[PDB]
């Protein structure tokens, strides 16, 4: 399952359960909007 931890993301990216070494993976923990400053007219 890709949506669990970075180790799970690494398996999904390579597409192989037996992932090779080399430090390759999905990057950038999505900084989710802590709040929302909707300030329109």
């Amino acid at each position: 399952d890709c949506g669990f931890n970075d180790l799970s993301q690494l398996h999904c990216s390579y597409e192989s359960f037996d992932v090779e070494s080399g430090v390759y993976s999905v990057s950038s923990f999505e900084a989710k909007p802590s709040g929302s400053v909707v300030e329109q007219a």
Binding site: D18, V23, S25
Partner: protein
């Protein structure tokens, strides 16, 4: 008076309040994640 301030990239980098207080606007940071993995161990180390 313009209120909306933009950089050379033209991304919105400033907002002016009605009272005139000005807040810098910076896009949310990446917080990057990488995986250090050894096949023989079958274990991984989270990298930022």
């Amino acid at each position: 008076q313009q209120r909306f301030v933009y950089d050379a990239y033209q991304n919105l980098v400033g907002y002016y309040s009605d009272d005139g207080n000005y807040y810098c606007l910076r896009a949310c940071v990446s917080v990057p994640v990488s995986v250090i993995y050894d096949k023989e161990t079958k274990t991984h180390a989270t990298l930022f």
